[PDB]
Symmetry: C3
């Protein structure tokens, strides 16, 4: 509604994989639309980065080999503020939806939060590449920021909760 600022291993890798697939669909949908060049580029960058998160959590078995970097988290952070600055200031709570593209991005937002829940469970039973966790944490808010920008740029207001 706003910006929030072992089997456990295979489950984390799996959900991140799933999350990556929904980002793919959002990429394919956003592609058929001009004016989202940076976003589509950013999205593709997320898929490679998420691909890395999987490896860091499962495949990789040496910290020296961890691929995901801290800069990827910072990048996500700067886009959130940038997309927020862009989008009109929101004084209301948001509901998932609006343009088709914004909807797919919100879906990716919730699946990202799901992937994060799964990673939090993995980190509780063993040591992981903590960068991954923070990356997923920032990632969902990025999709929130993105979806709002996608609606505005499409001329469609965000769906708001009014009760």
């Amino acid at each position: 509604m706003k910006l929030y600022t072992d089997s456990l291993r295979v489950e984390s890798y799996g959900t991140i994989d799933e999350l990556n697939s929904f980002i793919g669909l959002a990429l394919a949908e956003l592609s058929g639309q001009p004016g989202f060049e940076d976003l589509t580029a950013e999205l593709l960058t997320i898929q490679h980065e998420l691909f890395d998160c999987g490896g860091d959590l499962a495949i990789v078995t040496e910290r020296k080999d961890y691929k995901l970097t801290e800069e990827s988290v910072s990048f996500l952070e700067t886009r959130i503020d940038a997309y927020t600055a862009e989008a009109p200031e929101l004084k209301k709570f948001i509901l998932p939806g609006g343009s088709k593209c914004a909807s797919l991005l919100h879906i990716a937002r919730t699946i990202t939060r799901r992937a994060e829940r799964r990673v939090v469970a993995l980190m509780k039973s063993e040591e992981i590449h903590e960068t991954v966790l923070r990356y997923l944490n920032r990632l969902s808010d990025y999709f929130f920021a993105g979806a709002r920008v996608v609606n505005a740029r499409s001329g469609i207001g965000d769906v708001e909760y009014e009760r």
Copy 2:
């Protein structure tokens, strides 16, 4: 704060999202003004559902929302041609999305169920979700009916 509660709020938000997509899609075709306004209301109620489960200290969801669903479930079940066999998820794109909403709703229900077992919750939420999956089943059928598409039945050919 507690996985079971957070897991339920998140699965409900996930559900709400897919509804957002189904609504975006449904809004592109005529003859679905009733379904459109409802999905929007459902999103608000789901918002309330989440909040009601997030509470750990009154509730927002009302028993009337559960009743409204049932009514619409009948109105739609009637409008649609009586079925005499098990139906498979699919048909038009809209109906396919509503069906997805149905399964995710079932998922959200399972999570709330597991939550309930560990602690007290606003039970109206567990009922709302239980009917919602049926509403989508009935909404998914109507959409195909309306679009003169037709529900995908379980026809051998394997």
Copy 3:
């Protein structure tokens, strides 16, 4: 102990729903009449899987995917690099169906621990995930879109008008 069984049914149901959506988008375009028919039988067999966990599904359906996989694999240009989910909207949906098929797999696998069940459902789901992978590729090939590849350096080359 009993919750693991319902979770497996719902997940399979959820998986079947995304498949219907994939089919809805895929059938909309010509040249994929083969997949359109295949995905169908898949939903029927997946409908059986649920029942088998509450036996209609046979080992014959499992071998069906086998052939389809290699066929599409041969048909699609042999990949020489890691690919990411995506491409055409159809490949994207089929790729989604893939990750979800694997999610249903984990649920059934969990059902194993609590109590052994028809060891056929797993076999199918296990191959179904591979099927969608290949299916997604052949779809991107026939559309001349080309699967998304894991290549960071190729990103800077993307249009950045705004």
